[PDB]
Amino acid sequence: RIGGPPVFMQFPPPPPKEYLADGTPKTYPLHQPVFDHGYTWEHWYMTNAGVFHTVYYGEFAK
Amino acid sequence: HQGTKPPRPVSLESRFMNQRRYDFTWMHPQDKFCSECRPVELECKKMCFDRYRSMDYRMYGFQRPRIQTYYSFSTC
Amino acid sequence: IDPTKNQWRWCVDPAWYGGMRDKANMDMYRLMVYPFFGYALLYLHSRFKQNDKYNVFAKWR
Amino acid sequence: IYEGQTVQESELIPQEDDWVIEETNFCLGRNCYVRFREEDDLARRALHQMDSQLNKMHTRLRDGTVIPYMSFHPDEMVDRPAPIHTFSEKPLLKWTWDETYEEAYDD
Amino acid sequence: NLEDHFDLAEYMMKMHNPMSEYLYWIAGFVSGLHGILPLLHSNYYFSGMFLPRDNDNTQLCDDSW
Amino acid sequence: YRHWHRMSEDDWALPLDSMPEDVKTLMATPQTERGFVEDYWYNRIRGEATLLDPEALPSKSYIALARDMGLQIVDEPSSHMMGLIELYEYLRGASFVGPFGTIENPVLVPAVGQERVVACTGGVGDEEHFTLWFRCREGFMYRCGECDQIFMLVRLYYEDRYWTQTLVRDTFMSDGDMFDLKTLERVHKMWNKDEMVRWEVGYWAQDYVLGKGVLPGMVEEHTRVN
Amino acid sequence: KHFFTDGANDYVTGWENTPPLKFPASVMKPCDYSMTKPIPKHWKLRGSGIHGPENTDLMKLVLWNRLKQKRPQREVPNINYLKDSIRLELSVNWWLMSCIFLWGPWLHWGQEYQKVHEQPPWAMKRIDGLRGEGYFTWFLE
Amino acid sequence: GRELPEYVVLPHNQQRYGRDKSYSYFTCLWHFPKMVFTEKWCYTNIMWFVFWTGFWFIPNYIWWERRYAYQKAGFHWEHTNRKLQARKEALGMDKVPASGMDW
Amino acid sequence: RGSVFQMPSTPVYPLTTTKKVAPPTALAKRTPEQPFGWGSPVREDRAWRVVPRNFIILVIVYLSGWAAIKTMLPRGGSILGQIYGGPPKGRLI
Amino acid sequence: FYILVNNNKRIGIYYIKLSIIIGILGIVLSYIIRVELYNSGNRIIKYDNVNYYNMVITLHGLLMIFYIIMPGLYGGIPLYILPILSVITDIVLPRINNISIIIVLISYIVVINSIVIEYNIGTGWTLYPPLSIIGTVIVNMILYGLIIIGISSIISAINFMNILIVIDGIIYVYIWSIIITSVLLIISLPILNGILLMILSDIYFNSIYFILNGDVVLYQHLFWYFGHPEVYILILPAFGIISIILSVLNNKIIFGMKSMILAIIMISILGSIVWAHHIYTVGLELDTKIYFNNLTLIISIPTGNKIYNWIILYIGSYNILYNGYQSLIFSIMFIIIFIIGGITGIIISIDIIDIGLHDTYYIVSHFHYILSIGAVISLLAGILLLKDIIGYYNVIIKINKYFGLLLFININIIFTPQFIIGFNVMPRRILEYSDNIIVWNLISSIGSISTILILLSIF
Ligand SMILES: CCCCCCCCCCCCCCCCCC(=O)OC[C@H](COP(=O)([O-])OCC(O)COP(=O)([O-])OC[C@@H](COC(=O)CCCCCCCCCCCCCCCCC)OC(=O)CCCCCCCCCCCCCCCCC)OC(=O)CCCCCCCCCCCCCCCCC
Ligand SMILES: CCCCCCCCCCCCCCCCCC(=O)OC[C@H](COP(=O)([O-])OCC(O)COP(=O)([O-])OC[C@@H](COC(=O)CCCCCCCCCCCCCCCCC)OC(=O)CCCCCCCCCCCCCCCCC)OC(=O)CCCCCCCCCCCCCCCCC
Ligand SMILES: CCCCCCCCCCCCCCCCCC(=O)OC[C@H](COP(=O)([O-])OCC(O)COP(=O)([O-])OC[C@@H](COC(=O)CCCCCCCCCCCCCCCCC)OC(=O)CCCCCCCCCCCCCCCCC)OC(=O)CCCCCCCCCCCCCCCCC
Ligand SMILES: CCCCCCCCCCCCCCCCCC(=O)OC[C@H](COP(=O)([O-])OCC(O)COP(=O)([O-])OC[C@@H](COC(=O)CCCCCCCCCCCCCCCCC)OC(=O)CCCCCCCCCCCCCCCCC)OC(=O)CCCCCCCCCCCCCCCCC
Ligand code: HEA
Ligand code: HEA
Ligand SMILES: CCCCCCCC/C=C\CCCCCCCC(=O)OC[C@H](COP(=O)(O)OCCN)OC(=O)CCCCCCC/C=C/CCCCCCCC
Ligand SMILES: CCCCCCCC/C=C\CCCCCCCC(=O)O[C@H](COC(=O)CCCCCCC/C=C/CCCCCCCC)COP(=O)(O)OCCN
Ligand SMILES: [O-][O-]
Ligand SMILES: [Cu+2]
Ligand SMILES: [K+]
Ligand SMILES: [Zn+2]
């Protein structure tokens, strides 16, 4: 139907990036903390990635 | 036929007849008119309205003779 | 008649096809939110009082 | 019941005596929580998430064809996390039959 | 827009304000109080004590405390 | 198609009130610059002007006749694009069943975007397996991991646009000799005389060319109450 | 028929799986290529091969289902169809007639008999001294 | 049609936001109350909600309290009866006409 | 005019018999200031003024009448009670 | 917006979020019970306030069933993935979907408000008259909640049934489970509404259906005619989730798909005609008891087929894949736990055995193993499977073997003793008990306090 809701639209470009006065890129809130402690273990698990593939999923102590 | 329905014998209150746990107030939760009368017990309400009128509280209905009103279907 | 000039059908939700009228109707009900809260809160107070729940401490004093 | 595709003996004959089953790794790699950059704003983190989709990954075989990420159900086919509007174009469920019509061919 | 592609984009992109989570936990905490507060209120109303002493409704030894 | 609703009245013809009032400029506008309503009336005015001139039809070639009516001559490029459009439209509300896909003849998966979700159900009979869904992205020859069926994505894309009936017409149709308003007037007088109007589109069109409300009864025709 | 069914009683869109029997097979035919003879090996696949509008019969079915929606005159159905369309209406009307002219007379007769004899004419008279009409539907006693 | 630059340099030089600092299990016990009592948008919303909820609670409260006291005093016809009895005592008459009617 | 499927049996256009001046909308064209509606004469929008006015009047009458009944007339179970619910004239209570 | 959203996936999240919030109150109520039952004599509830305990058990049962598990399994997961499992974009009736979640919340607020404002008394979650109709206004408030909840359930059932019209793919086993559950609601809910209205009539309209010459057993028939289909409505969506998890995480096609689908259909048909095994002790006719007992046992046949089909899904799966994922462990745990609950259900199906075990804690343990462990674990397993799609974080549950082991050990400690207590015997819905049942009740109480502590570890 002409004029109906398009079945596909391209994303518009993202808004301009922001830099501080000194030139440092501006950071935004990020809820991925780097916990402080002495543990450094890394556990890996072969995970189902569909029916024919897997992925080696790693969990890091930090 | 309904306008001149013959009177029927007064029901004898049998073993399981006329059982009440609480007064009839679901029609008037706050006003509680005719708490003792049943929702469509006209004769009970008439005498109850008369008490309220005798207490200086107006109530509508049951005052005009049936044969002196229109649409009664009770005229000779 | 031009098919491309009716895009408001899918660009705007049907509940607001009416422009300011639909928005005004939505806005009017929004004004009643706090009046409703006070009204609802009063009912809780009414039941709480009628059940003598305010006299919990005075009952045993 | 399904027991795999039927195979004829002639289909198993190799064209060389040194042929062995290809040793291509179907482990897509090492992954973890998607790690965003503090410098990226909301829009650019969305691009980052869209570039970490396992269901957009595949394994390329020796003949150039790719075996993609596949799932029994279409729940694993939308972007993770699920976007507001998922199936803009209707997913196609491909059925196979032996019927054919002449218009499709040319002599 | 790219920001609108994902539902709850701020949370999924890990930028949401933490207050949203606090309210959710607070709402759950308030729901739990609906079982404890009326218990205390009802106990006091009918007994004059917020909570009983264990086995206080039964005969107790002289030295029981 | 089965998933379309009932034909509207406009699906057959448009009301004359939708005719552009500046007919002189309408007949001089290039096809790429005409909107849906403008293009409809350009073809109807020019198409009916040639059809309502019987004495000239036998000497007019099919190429010229098709041009006057606004019909596009079919060629392999245009036919290919239109065919894939209809296949895409049909698959919106119809099942997707066809021959088993191979490297020589991959299963064609039409799409507008760069990606479309597809399921493989294997072959026929015992060869049919459980649905295996995958994301068919452009530029890769996909191979089912179970039955080895080959899939390929076909994109309906052209010069920053996706294939549409109007896009195909604009790309391939070439505007011919500019429409001559003398033909409109000549045919108008042929079928419209002494209060009899058997060629009404031309009667309105001629009135607009002369301004508006010049011909008999047109002022009363254009006066409305609401 | 009242109820809408996609397969048979599809009056919302008017879609029909097959064309009318009026058309010669050369003009239009039902979309059935199950009997197509085996394709010669030297023939090459040009089209998709996918079931759809590339097949002539399906294209003509889609075209006709859209262009049939405007017709100069009505396509008059036979009386059998017209009867079926209002079967419930006609039967309810006859049911009303039966109530007026069959049920009414004997129900009136029973009440008149009941007046004189204290019980309906289709009931055994009682000897137990209880007063009143008694039952009405005798066979449910 | 709008033209935008690839990047913009902000006037200030403060890095206000970034990765969240490492926290413990009970970090919420002090951070949450800090936000309520220290963030403008937090306690402004709380005060706004409390003020208007209470604002509309008063008129409803006043109306119900008068109604509740009236109901406890008796039914509607009991209130009129007391006035009727008071009127009889005032005039000393055993029987008097009903309200809105003359002798 | 209406639908395109309704037409006269004989297609005839009347030769103007009067000399009345053409209404402005009969000769109007699309203009930048009026992209739509140039073919229809301008009309007053009464609904914008009458609806709120009528609604206010009805509400005022509705509320005022309700208040008057509950104040001027004696106490009664219902509005009909307060009007006709009194005892018969001459019946002392 | 937050309340105006019609997106089905958003609404699915709201159902899960709301169930957790209401779950806290349900857990609190459950915790109050086991603390009181730690030993003979009052512990946290005064003897003069025994009415409160009756309210605690009544709300614990009601909230957990209608406000926690049913929204979680029938409203939460289905609204998120069902339109995705179908090839369609969104739910058929978007506006109805929005109002359904709002209705659930309002009914919850009404229920909890009634706790605070009304006098606290209880009549059990089954609301048997005449006790239910001689109570205070809190019973009236609870009825309004149930009726309001009934509206949301039926409209949500209508929403799912419409998927058959628009589904553009294959009807997977999970889709069948939701569809058949909707069918059960459509046929059972109107019966529930009718009898609930009669309860209101006696409470509020001076009706006399539940006084002498009016059979009180009439209520039990109509209630349980909905009551048992309800338990099957709760579990059937759980069966659908297990089928998806086992097939997906083992890379094995679901074996006997049609047998699974027919088993679900068979269970619903049988589940609609076996309600009277809840009424064995009332004194039904001999032939009536034999019929219901015989048909009740038959429900095990289709239920058994599903169990075995699940087992073969896990058997033979590749060893290289890590099997310690919480979703996989929960799915496997469900088979082990459900068998325990179902077998005990067959034991109490024999009416003569039921004579001794009716209204005892053996029945409690029976439905806790199925619901408190099985249904919860199935809901947990499904949410874990969809963690990437849903996108929640800030929890440690995906790979946490401690949580799975501790949960399994401690829940079994709570409810295994309750089977033993059933033969001892301890009645249900009881606050005090004889001194010689303390040991088993004490062990279960220690289990309850332990489970609550474990929940704090996920954060
Ligand atoms: C069963 C338990 C165990 C479960 C284990 C298994 C779990 C498995 C995982 C399950 C996961 C499911 C899927 C999750 C998907 C999540 C998606 C998501 O995050 O969506 C984004 C969504 C919103 O994010 P967003 O997009 O940024 O939204 C922006 C806003 O829309 C706009 O921003 P804004 O700032 O403008 O916001 C407006 C804000 C404005 O904010 C403010 O102004 C805040 C001001 C500060 C107020 C703070 C509270 C103050 C309280 C004071 C109390 C005083 C008491 C005094 C007592 C005195 C006694 C003497 O709020 C309002 O204006 C309205 C607030 C109304 C709601 C809150 C109501 C609170 C309770 C009220 C109670 C009233 C009681 C009255 C009773 C009276 C009876 C008569 O996130 C949330 O809403 C938070 C979700 C958090 C959980 C996420 C899941 C994590 C995994 C689970 C963790 C475990 C949870 C356990 C349960 C809780 C335990 C307690
Ligand atoms: C003794 C003297 C006193 C006698 C008193 C009698 C009292 C009777 C009370 C009845 C009350 C009124 C109900 C009907 C009102 C509408 C009447 C009307 O318009 O009729 C003319 C009109 C005639 O239609 P037409 O298209 O013009 O037909 C033209 C020709 O007649 C030729 O048409 P055609 O043959 O070519 O076929 C076209 C038409 C043909 O259909 C009709 O015309 C229907 C006519 C029905 C009339 C009523 C007769 C009584 C039906 C009894 C059914 C009992 C069910 C089993 C109960 C088991 C209990 C243990 O198809 C439809 O219209 C399809 C309608 C949709 C059907 C949906 C059915 C859903 C339920 C399926 C069964 C569920 C259980 C499965 C169990 C097995 C599991 C493995 O009927 C309709 O269009 C009505 C359709 C819309 C209303 C359907 C209501 C379905 C209710 C389903 C309840 C399921 C409950 C399941 C659980 C129960 C146990 C817990
Ligand atoms: C020496 C000694 C000698 C002794 C000699 C003794 C002699 C004894 C003689 C005994 C004779 C016995 C004869 C037995 C053999 C009978 C053979 C026969 O013909 O059978 C078939 C014959 C007719 O069946 P058929 O051939 O299938 O009918 C052909 C149709 O045309 C089929 O065509 P169709 O299907 O197209 O039909 C039209 C159909 C087409 O359908 C449609 O258009 C499609 C839609 C259908 C579904 C409709 C859904 C609902 C519609 C909504 C609209 C409702 C409107 C009304 C609303 C009312 C509101 C209040 O639509 C309708 O019919 C239905 C709509 C019409 C209105 C419905 C009204 C409500 C009906 C339900 C309630 C009925 C109870 C009412 C009770 C009163 C009021 C409370 O059956 C009977 O007549 C029954 C047999 C009765 C046997 C009684 C035996 C006991 C009595 C003995 C009396 C004599 C004893 C005297 C003493 C003797 C002592 C010695
Ligand atoms: C010759 C030609 C002659 C022509 C003559 C023409 C005469 C025309 C006369 C016209 C005037 C009529 C006046 C009477 C009208 C009826 C009024 C009435 O009483 O209605 C209720 C009446 C019973 O009331 P009642 O016992 O009389 O009054 C007792 C008092 O209310 C005692 O008070 P209470 O304290 O017991 O009541 C509790 C209180 C409870 O109060 C509370 O709870 C609140 C208290 C504190 C509030 C303070 C503020 C704080 C914030 C509050 C926020 C609230 C909202 C929160 C959110 C929601 C939750 C609440 O309730 C209320 O306040 C009641 C009203 C509540 C508001 C309802 C909405 C009304 C809106 C109306 C206007 C529309 C909107 C305007 C907007 C304007 C914008 C510019 O019920 C019925 O009428 C039942 C029968 C159904 C209708 C029958 C119609 C028959 C028509 C007959 C036609 C005859 C034709 C003859 C033709 C002959 C041809 C020959
Ligand atoms: C999800 C909840 C749920 C589920 C699935 C079930 C399932 C079953 N329930 Fe349950 N039941 C409840 C919830 C549930 N129940 C509740 C809440 C109560 C108490 C209500 C109240 O009183 O308040 C209750 C009460 C209850 C009673 C007692 C009612 C009373 O008198 O108070 C009985 C009696 O037979 C019973 C039976 C069954 C049976 C036979 C099944 C069957 O579906 C189980 C079948 C499963 C198996 C048998 C195991 C799997 C099969 C195999 C391993 C192989 C085949 C096995 C055999 C042939 C034995 N239930
Ligand atoms: C879904 C229903 C459900 C659930 C989860 C539970 C959970 C629990 N119940 Fe039960 N219970 C009932 C339904 C439920 N119950 C019913 C219907 C009755 C009969 C009512 C009556 O007598 O009338 C009953 C009765 C009942 C009694 C008998 C009361 C009496 O007769 O005196 C007791 C006693 O200890 C008890 C204890 C518990 C305990 C200790 C838990 C839990 O603590 C067990 C372990 C669980 C946890 C530690 C919490 C885990 C988290 C969740 C369950 C929420 C998850 C939410 C999401 C995933 C969204 N329950
Ligand atoms: C402009 C005004 C127009 C008014 C007229 C047109 C509109 C009419 C609208 C439909 C009216 C339908 C009324 C239905 C209720 C009828 C009540 C009734 O008749 O009940 C009595 C009848 C028989 O009783 P008896 O008197 O003993 O019979 C003896 C015979 N002499 O049955 C009963 O008693 C049962 C009563 C059931 C009433 C159910 C109606 C709903 C009431 C809900 C109240 C809830 C209040 C609590 C707060 C919540 C508020 C939603
Ligand atoms: C136009 C559509 C019309 C549809 C109408 C549908 C009507 C039925 C709807 C469901 C309600 C069923 C009626 C309720 C039956 C209750 C009977 C009962 O409780 O009786 C038992 C006895 O009942 C039995 O023996 C049990 C029989 C089971 C009846 C089940 C009927 C309803 C089944 C619906 C299941 C779903 C539909 C299945 C369809 C087919 C599936 C293949 C009590 O016995 P005692 O107390 O001992 O008294 C005996 C004498 N003193
Ligand atoms: O209920 O089992
Ligand atoms: Cu049961
Ligand atoms: K105790
Ligand atoms: Zn395949």
The residue contributing the CA closest to ligand 1 atom 38 is E20
Tokens found for residue J122: 């209880």
Distance between CA atoms of J345 and B53, rounded to whole angstroms? 65
Distance between CA atoms of I37 and I29, rounded to whole angstroms? 10
Distance between CA atoms of A40 and A35, rounded to whole angstroms? 11
- How far is D71 from chain J, CA to nearest CA, in Å? 8
Cis peptide before G40 (omega within 30 of 0): no
The residue contributing the CA closest to ligand 7 atom 43 is B26
Distance between CA atoms of F67 and F47, rounded to whole angstroms? 8
Span from the CA of J160 to the centroid of ligand 11 (angstroms): 45
Residues of F in contact with J170 (CB under 8 A): 131
Q: Strands D27-31 and A54-60, how do they pair? A: parallel
Helix H or strand E encompassing G89: helix G87-98
DSSP 8-state class, residue D82:
P
Query: Do the Cβ atoms of J363 and J422 come closer than 8 Å?
Result: yes
Using DSSP, state whether D28 is helix, strand or coil: strand
Ligand 6 near J69 CB (within 6 A): yes
Query: Do the Cβ atoms of J142 and J203 come closer than 8 Å?
Result: no
Tokens found for residue A7: 């079945």
- How far is E17 from chain C, CA to nearest CA, in Å? 25
β-sheet bridge partners, residue F162: F157
- How far is A41 from chain J, CA to nearest CA, in Å? 15
Is the alpha carbon torsion for J130, J135, J140, J145 positive or negative?
Answer: negative
Tokens found for residue J400: 């946490």
Distance between CA atoms of F130 and J90, rounded to whole angstroms? 24
Distance between CA atoms of J44 and E51, rounded to whole angstroms? 6
DSSP string, chain F: -TTS-PPPSTTT---GGGS-S-HHHHTTS-GGG--HHHHHHHHHHHHHHHHT-GGGGGGS-HHHHHHHHTPPPP-HHHHHHHHHHHHHHHHHSS-EEEPPP-SSSPEEEEESSSEEEEEEEESSGGGEEEEEEEEEETT--EE-TTT--EEEEEE-EETTEE--HHHHHHHH----SPPPHHHHHHHHHHHEETTEES-HHHHHHHHHHT-SS-STTHHHHH----
Distance between CA atoms of J387 and J393, rounded to whole angstroms? 8
Breaks (C-N over 2.5 A) in chain I follow: none
| Closest to J340 (Cα-Cα) out of J372, J312, J294, J381 | J372
Residue type present at position B29: P
* Contacts with E57 (C-beta within 8 Å, 6 or more apart), sequence order: J41, J42, J46, J47
Distance between CA atoms of F168 and F73, rounded to whole angstroms? 11
DSSP string, C23-48: HHHHHHHHTTHHHHHHHHHHHHHHHH
Using DSSP, state whether J168 is helix, strand or coil: coil
Tokens found for residue E23: 């309210």
Distance between CA atoms of J183 and J204, rounded to whole angstroms? 32
Residue D82 contacts E, CB cutoff 8 Å: yes
Distance between CA atoms of E16 and D45, rounded to whole angstroms? 13
DSSP 8-state class, residue D91:
P
| Residue to mutate, H39, H43, H46, ligand 1, most ligand atoms under 8 Å from C-beta | H46
Backbone angles phi, psi at A48, to 5 degrees: -65, 130
Burial class (CB in 10 A: 0-12, 13-18, 19+), J330: buried
Residue type present at position D72: F
Residue F193 to residues F203, G53, I7: CA-CA distances in angstroms? 10, 47, 19
Residues of C in contact with E45 (CB under 8 A): 53, 56, 59
H-type alpha helices, chain D: 42-50
Tabulate helix, strand, coil % of chain E (nearest 5): 55, 0, 45
Q: At CB < 8 Å, which residues of chain A contact F?
A: 2, 7-8, 51-52
Tokens found for residue D106: 């040319």
Q: Is D64 left (phi over 0), alpha (psi -120 to 50) or beta?
A: left
Span from the CA of J295 to the centroid of ligand 9 (angstroms): 13
Backbone angles phi, psi at J80, to 5 degrees: -85, -50
Span from the CA of G3 to the centroid of ligand 2 (angstroms): 11
Residue type present at position F199: W
Using DSSP, state whether J401 is helix, strand or coil: helix
What Rg do the C-alpha atoms of chain B give, in angstroms?
15
Ligand 2 near G100 CB (within 6 A): no
Question: Method of determination?
Answer: cryo-EM
Tokens found for residue A27: 């950071």
Ligand 6 near J61 CB (within 6 A): yes
Tabulate helix, strand, coil % of chain J (nearest 5): 75, 0, 25
H-type alpha helices, J37-93: 50-62, 70, 77-85
Using DSSP, state whether I76 is helix, strand or coil: strand
Ligand 5 near J237 CB (within 6 A): no
Span from the CA of J30 to the centroid of ligand 9 (angstroms): 20
Q: Strands F150-155 and D92-96, how do they pair? A: unpaired
| Residue among H2, H7, H9 with most chain A CBs within 10 A, to mutate | H9
Neighbours of H90 (CB within 10 A): 9
Provide the annotated active-site residues of J.
60, 90, 125, 152-153, 228, 230, 232, 243, 277-278, 303, 306, 428
β-sheet bridge partners, residue F116: F136
Q: Strands F115-122 and F128-137, how do they pair? A: antiparallel
Residues of J in contact with C53 (CB under 8 A): 117
Query: Do the Cβ atoms of F134 and D93 come closer than 8 Å?
Result: no
Q: Mark yes or no for CB contact J206/B26 under 8 Å.
A: yes
Q: Mark yes or no for CB contact F97/D97 under 8 Å.
A: yes
Burial class (CB in 10 A: 0-12, 13-18, 19+), J353: middle
Following CA atoms G39, G40, G43, G45 in sequence, which dihedral angle do they give, to the nearest 10 degrees? 30
| CB contact burial F29-42 (16+ within 10 A = b; e otherwise) | bebeebeebbbbbb
Tokens found for residue I55: 């609604």
| Closest to G114 (Cα-Cα) out of G123, G103, G105 | G123
H-type alpha helices, H18-96: 27-38, 40-73, 76-91
Distance between CA atoms of J307 and J191, rounded to whole angstroms? 31
Distance between CA atoms of J196 and J209, rounded to whole angstroms? 12
Neighbours of A33 (CB within 10 A): 12
Burial class (CB in 10 A: 0-12, 13-18, 19+), J230: buried
Count of helices and strands (H, E) across chain G:
4, 1
Q: Mark yes or no for CB contact E19/H35 under 8 Å.
A: yes
Distance between CA atoms of B21 and B23, rounded to whole angstroms? 7
Distance between CA atoms of J447 and J445, rounded to whole angstroms? 5
DSSP string, J204-238: HS---TTSTTS-THHHHHHHHHHHHHHHHHHHHHH
Burial class (CB in 10 A: 0-12, 13-18, 19+), H5: exposed
Distance between CA atoms of J376 and J69, rounded to whole angstroms? 7
* Contacts with I6 (C-beta within 8 Å, 6 or more apart), sequence order: none
Using DSSP, state whether E56 is helix, strand or coil: coil
Residue of A nearest to H6 (CA): A16
Distance between CA atoms of E46 and C53, rounded to whole angstroms? 11
Tokens found for residue F188: 């108008």
Strands (E), J78-126: none
Burial class (CB in 10 A: 0-12, 13-18, 19+), J321: middle
